[PDB]
Amino acid sequence: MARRPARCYRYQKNKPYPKSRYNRAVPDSKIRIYDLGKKKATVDEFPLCVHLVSNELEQLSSEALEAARICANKYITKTVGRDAFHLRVRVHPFHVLRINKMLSCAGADRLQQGMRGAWGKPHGLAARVDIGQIIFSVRCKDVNKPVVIEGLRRARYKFPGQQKIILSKKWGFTNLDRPEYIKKRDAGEIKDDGAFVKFLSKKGSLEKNYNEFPEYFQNLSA
Amino acid sequence: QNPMRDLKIEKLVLNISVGESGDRLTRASKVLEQLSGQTPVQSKARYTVRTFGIRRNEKIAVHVTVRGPKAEEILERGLKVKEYQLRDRNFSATGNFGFGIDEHIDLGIKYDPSIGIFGMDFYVVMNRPGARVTRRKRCKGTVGNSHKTTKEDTVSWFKQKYDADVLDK
Amino acid sequence: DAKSSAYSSRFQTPFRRRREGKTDYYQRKRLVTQHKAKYNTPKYRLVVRFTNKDIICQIISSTITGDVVLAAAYSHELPRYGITHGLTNWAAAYATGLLIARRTLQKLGLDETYKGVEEVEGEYELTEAVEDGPRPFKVFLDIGLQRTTTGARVFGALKGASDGGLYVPHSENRFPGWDFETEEIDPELLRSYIFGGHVSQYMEELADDDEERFSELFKGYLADDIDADSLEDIYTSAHEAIRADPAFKPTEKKFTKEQYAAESKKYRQTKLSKEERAARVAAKIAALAGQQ
Amino acid sequence: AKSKNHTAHNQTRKAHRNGIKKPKTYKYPSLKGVDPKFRRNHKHALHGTAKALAAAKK
Amino acid sequence: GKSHGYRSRTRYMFQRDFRKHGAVHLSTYLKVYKVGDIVDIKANGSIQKGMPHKFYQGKTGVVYNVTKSSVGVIINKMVGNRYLEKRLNLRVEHIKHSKCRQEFLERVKANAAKRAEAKAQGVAVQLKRQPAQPRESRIVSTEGNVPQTLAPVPYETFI
RNA sequence: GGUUGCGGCCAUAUCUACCAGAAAGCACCGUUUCCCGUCCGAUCAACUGUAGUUAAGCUGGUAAGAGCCUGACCGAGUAGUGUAGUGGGUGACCAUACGCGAAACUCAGGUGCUGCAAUCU
RNA sequence: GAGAACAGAAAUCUCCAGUAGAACAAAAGGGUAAAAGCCCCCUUGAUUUUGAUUUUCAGUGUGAAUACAAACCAUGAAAGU
RNA sequence: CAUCUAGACAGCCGGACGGUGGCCAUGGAAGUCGGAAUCCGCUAAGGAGUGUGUAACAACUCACCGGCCGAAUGAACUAG
RNA sequence: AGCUCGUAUCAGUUUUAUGAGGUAAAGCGAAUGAUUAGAGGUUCCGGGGUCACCUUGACCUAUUCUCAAACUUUAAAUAUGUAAGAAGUCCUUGUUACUUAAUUGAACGUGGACAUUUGAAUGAAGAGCUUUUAGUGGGCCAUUUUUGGUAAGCAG
């Protein structure tokens, strides 16, 4: 059957209704990939982080997430290549939408009881977002800033509501600011872990910290 | 080093696992009481598998446990058929070790008719004097990490006794 | 091994004496509780515990902040009364059960009445309440984690306390000589256990057998030159001395508590504070990294 | 056909128009549900102390 | 079909508290309750005998009856336009002593002691509690405390 | 101050490694005639504290330890929320006024205390 | 997880780890570790007399439950249940 | 955010030595090219040009400066 | 219609003290159920590649992204229970067939001491009790929370 418009499920009017042991007959999400580009790149390779942030409390459907994922990826791949960016789709469509399917043929009043038994069968998935919640996070080098800006601006047209694009003072996807990340990287407290980094804590076993971060103790002795 | 830290035979358990019950099990029970000098118990089957011919609580197995000098003399004659030599395998990570043979009626006892031929699984439990602290009722403590049994100290115990060899593969 | 952090975070520890293993708290709940319409009357527990070379009997009552002790009787006070060897046997358990019963009866002032049995014959006899007088002191046997076995020493102390005038409710199923085929006790076997016939008949059989185990065991018997027929004599003498003087003469306590605290503190390990801990990890962060 | 199934509108206003007043308990409440061993003894204690006070006041 | 059983909607209120599961600690069975004492009901969910209803959890009432392994508690219950007294036979592990009564009791002991000392000296010794009175006038000096000026912060995205 | 018996609060007490323990005590240990219970005196029951031992249990200490507990003008008066407006905004929601007020995070400290009785270079 | 002839994913045995992730007749929820689970032993309290109380509630019934009193029993060594 | 009296943004006049000649599948590797970037003898001016011209100059505007106009301009956004 | 009394045994209220809750929020480098991405460590319980071979099938550890009406360590606001005394406190000694080992406690007592305020604030506009009976037992709207629904001047 044909899908309803997104104005039917735009606002967070219901409680979050995930796929569980009670809600079993849920169709799969139309979005399946959430890390794109050079996702295997080191954190030092991509210092700039650009966030697409929702400004409204609404629901983004999984189809809108997939269409915005395709549209943003297609522009950045065509402009600055594939390995110049890492696109991360932060939000995930866990909220299951319900549809009460009404018959549109003549004589439908006999075969349909109206609002009796009106509990909706599962229709699709949607990502419930809040105000200030990050939708897309694209990290890249400092050179490719307006390409990612235009890529995230072209991703807004597939999204309901109002979204804003902000550049992040965080070094990539980390929770640390750019000067604080530079101090820990220069002091050797940062170890690469493929897609993210592990930070040296001042708590824990010193033998395990010596095995994991040998550069910090060598530089402390220096 | 310490006389309270040397190994000893805690217990030595003989278990056999017959495919069914009945006459074969009763012959299996009497060969073990002739083996050990004490009656064995008949282990009941836990479930039904569809492949082994066993149903639940059918008494498909027989096991008995000997301790002390009886366990020592049966381990001497248990390695006489195993030629006082063994592998780096068959030793558990907790220091215990076991081995299986295919015959006992014509091993070191006289053969008698209407008893069958039965193999068996020896299993030996090794610990130190001081294993009561994890088995007593009041103040059931643990064992110290320098007092546990490993593979290395038990193969070394298996060297200092029997003049044995290891890794026959 | 290698327990996860989530396991340690959710781990609800038991009660400390359950962790030690000395207390059955499900058992403790139905001993130490009281009928709530017996409002502030404490329920008194006869607790008999078996460490090695000791019988520990104490009449104790559970309160809010802990258990207070009325009368505590130990094994090592019986060498004063005469029992020099075998301070953890069945007969010594009877003697310290007899001792603690006479001790708490004289503590509460009921020593003149409630004599129990002056001569022991080995029959199950609850101490009856006297006609127009005070009731006998009602304690209950709290055996703890020991197993309930017919002919065990905790029932020896139970028999000894019941023979001392202490009212402790029990049955004769756990006394030695209990027939499993009829409900009749063996009073001759119980009396022999009371006076040590289960050790004296072992002694005469071992003396008739050999000398090697009769000198490895029972070497204190050969040291004090006491024989198999003298076991009943010294236990009757111990029983008479217990009835005569249950007044709990305490020991000397030489080299007193200030010196006890001083000598224990010199051979004890002190805790490094924040400054010493920070200094020693500063030493080891330089030593393990010192061009390593 | 259909109507309102249940509604707690106006119920608190109805309860508070005459007030949700306290039960106004008395001294010597009813000994209905107390322990019968205690109640039999309480009868015998009051029977004793009535005569004790009568003999005190002659 | 709707359900209104004895322990309906008691999924969370008849839990055991986290890392406080298992057997009840033994000061509960050794606390003494007298007739007229004030207790509050917190139903320990591990013991099923003598368990109160879900309404009485957190309620507070006087003990009218003291029984073998239980007490009798009078709770006032709002039934429509009046309160009805409810008599509960509850095991002692579902109750505890209310500390509001003992705080009143130590205030009584303090007031009796203050009245006893006011017979000697300092009569009208202010028996009644006063509320948090408004503060009297004070002098706030500025040595070492020169007032640092503050301004509103600019809007920073902090992301 | 140490230990033992019984505990109160029930991890500041638990857990993983490593080290130490004078005297006492606890413990392992030693042996099966009796009571006793098992396939098995391993558990339990009995007997001897005698042949030995701190090896283990136990206690104490160490870990830039994990956990747990406490505190912080640390996050944060933030999220949330009661009341109010003919406030804003198409709405979604947000802002203000009068209040109340988190949790995660981060940092710092700590790692059992205590009651009764007995005992101890 | 480590092992032990047949014997392997799974037949029986042994050890270690195991806050319960098992089981408790049946829905789901709560509760339970020297237990409320598994095994063993003994029983009939799943008995009688009526009353009071809690929930549903009109503070009526029914149902179910709770704590007792008087007995008489069961079990345990007892407290107790 | 990038320029700006050392002269900016506009406007108008002037502008490719040959670098595609052992680097090109030599599709039409000589115009500005879909699988490529760096070369000075100059390099204000000599550009694998921003520019699939489909024929080893078949084509103009433009890479970036001059010329002289002599003051502020441009870009990306945000919300009334 | 009253009846009994005359400022209370009170209150759609606050404060103080003491609870109780499990929603909002928050949490998943905390359990349970979902979740995206990579990093590092194997038993002959398969290598499909030369039988111990660099040889991709896991699992575990440490990270990371996002959640949950029928998840949760934690955890509000609002609402809610109790108490804030003369029916109470303290001291002595009377009854019991209850209880205690007891001349022990429990309950009920007898006597005696309890003003500047008889023991928080504010108010009380009279308080409490009883009888009898009418009408009503179709509701609807608004802020906030909220369920089903695409929504409704929809239904709850």
Tell me about this structure.
Chain E: Belongs to the eukaryotic ribosomal protein eL21 family. Chain E: InterPro entries: Ribosomal_eL21, Ribosomal_eL21_CS, Ribosomal_eL21_sf, Translation_prot_SH3-like_sf. Chain E: There is a cross-link at residue 31 (Glycyl lysine isopeptide (Lys-Gly) (interchain with G-Cter in ubiquitin)). This is part of a larger assembly, with chains A (222 residues), B (169 residues), C (292 residues), D (58 residues) and E (159 residues). Chain A is of the alpha+beta class. Chain A has helices at residues 62-80, 108-111, 145-154, 178-186, 206-212, 214-221, and strands at residues 35-37, 48-54, 58-61, 85-89, 95-99, 121-129, 134-140, 163-168, 190-193, 196-199. In chain A, helix 1 (62-80) runs antiparallel to helix 3 (145-154). Chain A is elongated. With 169 residues, chain B is α+β, with helices and mostly antiparallel strands. Helices cover 21% and strands 19% of the residues of chain B. Chain B has a five-stranded antiparallel β-sheet, with helices on one face. Chain B starts with 7 loop residues before the first strand and ends in a 9-residue tail after the last helix. Chain C has 292 residues and is of the alpha+beta class. Helices cover 42% and strands 8% of the residues of chain C. A four-stranded mixed β-sheet of chain C has the order 3-2-1-4, with helices on both faces. Chain C starts with a helix and ends in a 5-residue tail after the last helix. Chain E has a five-stranded antiparallel β-sheet with strand order 4-3-2-1-5, with no helix packed on it. In chain E, a hairpin with a 3-residue loop joins strand 2 (60-66) and strand 3 (70-79). Chain E is extended. Chain E starts with 37 loop residues before the first strand and ends in a 39-residue tail after the last helix. Chain A binds chain C through residues 206, 210, 217-218, 220-221, and chain C through 281, 284-286, 288-292. The structure holds four RNA strands.
Distance between the termini of chain D: 80 Å
Number of helices of chain D: 2
Beta strand count of chain E: 5
Structural class of chain D: mainly alpha
Number of helices of chain E: 1
PDB class: ribosome
Keywords: RNA modification, 2'-O-methylation, IRES initiation, eEF2, Ribosome
Entry title: Hypomethylated yeast 80S bound with Taura syndrome virus (TSV) internal ribosome entry site (IRES), eEF2, GDP, sordarin, and hibernating factor Los2
Chain A: 60S ribosomal protein L10
What's the layout of helices and strands?
The structure is cut from a larger assembly and holds chains A (222 residues), B (169 residues), C (292 residues), D (58 residues) and E (159 residues).
Chain A: E1 35-37, E2 48-54, E3 58-61, H1 62-80, E4 85-89, E5 95-99, H2 108-111, E6 121-129, E7 134-140, H3 145-154, E8 163-168, H4 178-186, E9 190-193, E10 196-199, H5 206-212, H6 214-221
Antiparallel strand pairs in A: 1-4, 2-7, 2-8, 3-6, 4-7, 5-6, 9-10
Chain D: H1 11-17, H2 36-56
Chain E: E1 38-41, E2 60-66, E3 70-79, E4 82-91, E5 95-97, H1 99-120
Antiparallel strand pairs in E: 1-2, 1-5, 2-3, 3-4
The structure holds four RNA strands.
